[PDB]
Amino acid sequence: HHWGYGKHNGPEHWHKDFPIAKGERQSPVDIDTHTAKYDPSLKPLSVSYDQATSLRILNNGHAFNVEFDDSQDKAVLKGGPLDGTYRLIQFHFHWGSLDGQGSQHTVDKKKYAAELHLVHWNTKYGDFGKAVQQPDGLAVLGIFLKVGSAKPGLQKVVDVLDSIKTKGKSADFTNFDPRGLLPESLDYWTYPGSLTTPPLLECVTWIVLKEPISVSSEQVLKFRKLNFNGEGEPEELMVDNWRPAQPLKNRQIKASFK
Ligand SMILES: [Zn+2]
Numbered sequence: 001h002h003w004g005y006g007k008h009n010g011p012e013h014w015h016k017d018f019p020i021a022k023g024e025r026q027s028p029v030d031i032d033t034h035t036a037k038y039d040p041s042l043k044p045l046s047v048s049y050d051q052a053t054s055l056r057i058l059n060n061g062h063a064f065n066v067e068f069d070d071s072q073d074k075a076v077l078k079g080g081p082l083d084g085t086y087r088l089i090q091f092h093f094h095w096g097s098l099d100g101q102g103s104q105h106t107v108d109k110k111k112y113a114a115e116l117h118l119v120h121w122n123t124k125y126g127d128f129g130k131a132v133q134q135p136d137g138l139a140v141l142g143i144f145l146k147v148g149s150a151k152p153g154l155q156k157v158v159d160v161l162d163s164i165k166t167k168g169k170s171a172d173f174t175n176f177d178p179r180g181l182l183p184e185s186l187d188y189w190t191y192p193g194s195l196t197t198p199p200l201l202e203c204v205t206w207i208v209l210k211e212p213i214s215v216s217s218e219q220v221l222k223f224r225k226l227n228f229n230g231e232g233e234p235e236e237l238m239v240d241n242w243r244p245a246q247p248l249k250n251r252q253i254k255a256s257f258k
C-alpha cells in the first residue's frame with residue numbers, strides 16, 4: 001500500500017511505486033575509505049547559518065523535520081563540490097531500534113546510531129519543487145551520530161518530541177541554531193546520489209562529514225518513542241527508518257582530505 005519501513009511496505013518494495021529505486025545513482029552507499037579518491041581540487045565547505053530562521057517541527061510519519069524559512073539567503077551552503085548557493089529548507093534524522101544500526105551511509109561497512117540530514121536546494125532553480133527535477137538541484141549534508149556524551153545543542157530538539165509524537169503533528173520551533181549540531185571538522189566525502197526516501201529522486205550531491213557527533217543514550221532513546229502512526233491508531237514506534245546500501249555502479253567517492 002503506501003511505502004514505509006515495515007515487512008510489507010519496506011525498502012525492498014519501493015521499486016514497485018518508484019521505479020527509480022533501481023536507478024544508477026541511488027543512495028545511500030557504503031563509503032570504502034581505501035577506494036575514495038582524495039581530490040585537492042575540492043574547496044572547503046562554507047556553512048553560513050548565522051541567520052537561520054527555524055519555524056516548525058513536524059512528525060511526517062517517516063521522520064521528524066525541523067523546517068526553516070528559505071524565502072531568502074539566510075542559511076546557506078556553498079563551496080565544497082558545489083557551484084552556486086544552496087539554501088537550507090529542513091533537517092531530519094534516520095535512526096535505529098538499537099545502537100548498532102540507524103545511519104544510511106556506512107563507512108567501511110560500519111553503521112552509526114543515526115544520521116542527520118541537512119537538506120539544501122539550489123537557488124538558481126527558484127523553489128524546492130523545481131530543484132528536485134535537476135541533477136544538481138539539492139545538496140544534503142550527512143552527519144553521523146555515535147552514542148557517547150550528550151550533545152547540548154540537540155537537547156532543545158529532544159524536549160519537544162513529546163508534543164509531535166504521532167504523524168501529522170507539528171509544533172512552533174523558532175530560534176533553533178543548527179550550528180550546535182556540527183562536528184568540529186568539516187572534512188568530507190562527496191558523490192552524486194539521490195534522496196534516501198521516496199521519491200528517491202537522483203538530484204542530490206551528497207556531502208558526508210568524516211567526523212561523527214556524539215549523543216547520549218538518553219537522547220537517542222527519545223527519538224525511538226515517536227510514532228509512525230497517527231493519533232488514535234495502533235502504536236508503531238518510529239525506529240529503523242533507514243534504507244540498505246545501494247550499489248555504487250558508475251560512481252566515484254571523492255575525499256576532501258587525505
Ligand atoms: Zn534523510
Ligand SMILES: [Zn+2]
Nearest residue numbers: 133134202203
Ligand atoms: Zn533530479
